[PDB]
Structure 1
């Protein structure tokens, strides 16, 4: 999990999802693409 103020897509498989008021990046190909904005 990467905790950043700037969360972005890092490859084609990474997706932006908003869960409970938090912008998150979940990526089905690369586990180290997980990100939450905090």
Structure 2
């Protein structure tokens, strides 16, 4: 995953979640889109 300060919804299957305070973006199609923080 990435740790960029401005996580975004890149593709359609991407999804925003707030775990343990940290905003993460989880995806079904491409694991590349998985990213943390921001």
Report which of the two has the higher share of strand.
1
After TM superposition, which residue ranges in structure 1, 4 or more long, deviate above 3 angstroms? none
Unaligned segments of structure 2, at least 5 residues: none
Length-normalised TM-score, structure 1: 0.93
TM score, norm. by length of structure 2: 0.93
Gap runs ≥5 in structure 1? none
Note the aligned Cα RMSD (angstroms): 1.0
* Aligned positions, number: 38
